[PDB]
Amino acid sequence: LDRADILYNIRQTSRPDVIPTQRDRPVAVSVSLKFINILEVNEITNEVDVVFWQQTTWSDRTLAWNSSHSPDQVSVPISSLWVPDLAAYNAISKPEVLTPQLARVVSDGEVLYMPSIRQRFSCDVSGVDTESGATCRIKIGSWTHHSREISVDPTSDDSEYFSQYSRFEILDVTQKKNSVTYSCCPEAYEDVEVSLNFRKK
Amino acid sequence: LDRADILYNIRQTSRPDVIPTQRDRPVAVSVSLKFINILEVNEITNEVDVVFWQQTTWSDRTLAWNSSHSPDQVSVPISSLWVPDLAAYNAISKPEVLTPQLARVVSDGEVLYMPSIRQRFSCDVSGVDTESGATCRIKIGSWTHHSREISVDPTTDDSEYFSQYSRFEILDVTQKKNSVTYSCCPEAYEDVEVSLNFRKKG
Amino acid sequence: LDRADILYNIRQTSRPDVIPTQRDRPVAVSVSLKFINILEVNEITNEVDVVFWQQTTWSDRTLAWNSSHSPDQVSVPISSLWVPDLAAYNAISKPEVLTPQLARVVSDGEVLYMPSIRQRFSCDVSGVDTESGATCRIKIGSWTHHSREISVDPTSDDSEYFSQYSRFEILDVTQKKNSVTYSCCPEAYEDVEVSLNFRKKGR
Amino acid sequence: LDRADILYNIRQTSRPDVIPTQRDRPVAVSVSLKFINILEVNEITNEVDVVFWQQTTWSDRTLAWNSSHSPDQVSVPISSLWVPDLAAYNAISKPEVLTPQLARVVSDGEVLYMPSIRQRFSCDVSGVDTESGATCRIKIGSWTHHSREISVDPTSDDSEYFSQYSRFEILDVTQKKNSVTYSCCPEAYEDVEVSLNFRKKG
Amino acid sequence: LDRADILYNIRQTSRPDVIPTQRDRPVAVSVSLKFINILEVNEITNEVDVVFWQQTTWSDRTLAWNSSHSPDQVSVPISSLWVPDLAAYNAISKPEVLTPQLARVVSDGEVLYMPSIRQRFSCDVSGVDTESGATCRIKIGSWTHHSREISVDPTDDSEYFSQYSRFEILDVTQKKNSVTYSCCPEAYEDVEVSLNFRKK
Ligand SMILES: NC1(C(=O)O)CCN(c2ccccc2)CC1
Ligand SMILES: *[C@@H]1O[C@H](CO)[C@@H](O)[C@H](O)[C@H]1NC(C)=O
Ligand SMILES: *[C@@H]1O[C@H](CO)[C@@H](O)[C@H](O)[C@H]1NC(C)=O
């Protein structure tokens, strides 16, 4: 198979509205934020404006093809794929996607989608000008899929990606799995809590 | 039935432009705002900038399927469903939807749509710096469907969802049914009046 | 007929690009602005930022159905209808539509479209802080249809709709028919001239 | 023929990607800016924010119909027509189109497209507060079509269109044909140079 | 062939989602930024707001036609072509395209796409008020195609720059580089554009 045939097959059979659950087991979505920049911080309003790469991976076996004498990977517009309905629960702006809306699909049906996103959050900015710094917690999970349909799995150098020219510096980035239950709904929603420990230079 | 079949059936037959009225009775829409944040307040201009979850529920029987050996619920893009044409009558900005535009559809045809919205309103900001606080009234109803086609009923801890990091705190949220009539339009439009009693901290 | 059938018929035979002129009629468009709020005013730049409901009515007989044992009215997305190409001749921003883009269609083919619009205008802001107040004139007409294809007529109670919480108050709103001809364009374009007489409140 | 038939024919057979060159001669595009407002001026940064009507005319014979017992003109969405790929070479913002995206097509295939555009430019703002005023030059031509495919031809005092309520006033507008050539690329690109001589009011 | 036939053929057989690799060799994309304006500079935040023409060329043989008794070139909307998924790695705003989204296609299948882009970057603004000036580095490469699928090669400076800018350009150097991250085992080719400029 060549790229043209694989991309034709994916475009024609996609089902972007269909979560690719296998035998009633959840789709395992891995999420990791790579912080690139901290653009604006307000200790009064407890608001941060940040740029991060939202590394997102999951498996969709309906995309898979025989890799023998074929590419191992193709670039696919996300309009042709099911994508996790991830939201930042404490976002106060729409995610502004800075990059081409393409994901990498591996021949086994693994999808790697890593948009660069600029977004504003409501989080703890207190202590940003101290040596301990602020710890801003960003919570990311499925908006409509509970633990039986989507699970969020949090799994090196925090400053490998971070701009040397930022007014701020990153002390630590921790990612923990959590679960939130709401009075509307008997179901638990999995999220990743991203703790951004940072300070002014 | 599996998810793929249910979502295929809904996409093919949903009729998103068709209000799902049963036997000439109005579609009962439940609306409840869960306030998440108050970002900006201006006592001079009487303007607030707020983030809320607009919990919206109604029944569309044309979406229903046999739940035996099937999912009880699916996630559906709102472009594939009829959705109430709700508007805030005192909004001064477009609703900025912060979340994926998906609704939950139950096998009985109940729809749950809860977007996170950031929006600016013209309302009473007077007394925001006092202990009694300001009471900002937000009116939400159908833009084009009158009382015979859509009824809007409020569903109802106010601060269960509210950000601990806001400069403001919520004293009380009351959500009451009302109606608006204008000279333009001979019909009554049902709304939910949401009274946000809040104040600056410290 | 039920709602589903009427909306199917409109969606399937909807020619949204086709002005519904009849034999020896222009399409008669009624326009009336209901001011809801005045958000920002600049006496230096002569700019206002306003929210208004643009009450718009006209007839499209191709939408009509037999009302016997049928709804009298349906809600239709404007993407499925011809809509007048109205523009504010002195607008300095794109109209920001704040409301769902649905119109009401009556069984006789009358269309009622009333978007809530936020828009900025270049107009006379001088005297906004006085008792007489400023008079800001907004001109709205068809961008491309002249008097033989579209006529614009004003449809009236000014302050029924206006926010009590505005920094400003409305003294008077007058809406009068006018016509503009420019040297560019040999035809006359009908407009509604909306005179917004308003002032700042005391603090 | 009625309007519905003409607009059907144009929608079905309009090749919007195909420049309507006749017998290997360039498409003659007429361009004239009618200034409506000057909203913001910065003498430090040499930037202006302006509103103008971009009067644009050209012929596309593939649109033509027999005018006998038919309309002489129809309104056509520009998505259904070939339109010149005009750009302002010294623009520092995207053209913000304030008007419905419709052109007028005459039965002989003449197209009149006149959008109202708000756009920011890098140009000479020096002397804006003097009696002689600033002269801001705006250059408009085809982005991708050279002189053999598109020619750009200008069609006084802009007092007829200019807002009496502007902080600024127009002293003179001159619109002259020019060409830009780069050393990289052997073809000339025709432009209209629009000299906006304006000043702040006393 | 006339323009109508060429544009019909391109529109119909346009696979815009398909990188036009020939025998598993990378598509060679040439990139050169022509700076037109520097609008805003902040030495505190290390942010610049710039306007540039992103001269982009590559070959797509599926677009090619016999030039005998035909046009040598046509203008094609980029929605009808494969276009490189180029991104500025240090951009802090979406590229704002100021120009009509058309490319030039030559009869041999060479594509010339040169949008005017306004974009904000995080880069070294230190020394902007000195005689040596600031050196702001902008890195542009494929977002999803590694070195085996796309190569980026750089191609007179200040022929294009606005005389009315508060800033002036001392030098522009454009050099090939490669970036590898711990996340991702593949190397991504970029062009590093060093904009040496200062306040007047
Ligand atoms: N497609 C163009 C290229 O060759 O790269 C055609 C020439 N061009 C241009 C830009 C502004 C003014 C005149 C020509 C760049 C795009
Ligand atoms: C749904 O299907 C099941 C299994 O075929 C059947 O037993 C059940 O009665 C059906 N429910 C209804 C409401 O018809
Ligand atoms: C236009 O009208 C003339 C006069 O009758 C006629 O001869 C000609 O064939 C007509 N054109 C078309 C396209 O029918």
Author numbering:
A (entry chain B): 20 to 174, 178 to 223
B (entry chain C): 20 to 175, 179 to 224
C (entry chain D): 20 to 174, 178 to 225
D (entry chain E): 20 to 174, 178 to 224
E (entry chain A): 20 to 174, 179 to 223
What did the original publication write about this model?
AChBPs are homopentameric, water-soluble homologs of the ligand-binding domain of LGICs and well-established structural surrogates for nicotinic acetylcholine receptors (nAChR). Importantly, AChBPs can bind nAChR-specific ligands and induce similar conformational changes as in the membrane bound receptors. LGICs are activated by ligands binding at subunit interfaces of their extracellular domains, thereby inducing conformational changes that affect the structure of a central pore and its ability to transport ions through the membrane. Additional density was found in all structures at the interface between the subunits in the orthosteric agonist and antagonist binding site, next to loop C in which the respective ligands could be modelled.
In total, five structures of Ls-AChBP in complex with a ligand were successfully solved. The electron density in the binding site region was generally poor, indicating that compounds may have had several binding modes in the site. Notably, binding of FL1888, VUF24234 and VUF6105 results in a movement of the loop closer to the compound, while binding of FL1856, FL3044, FL1613 and FL1909 does not have the same effect. The plot indicates that binding of nicotine, FL1613, FL1909, FL1856 and FL3044 do not result in any significant conformational changes in this region, while binding of FL1888, VUF24234 and VUF6105 do.
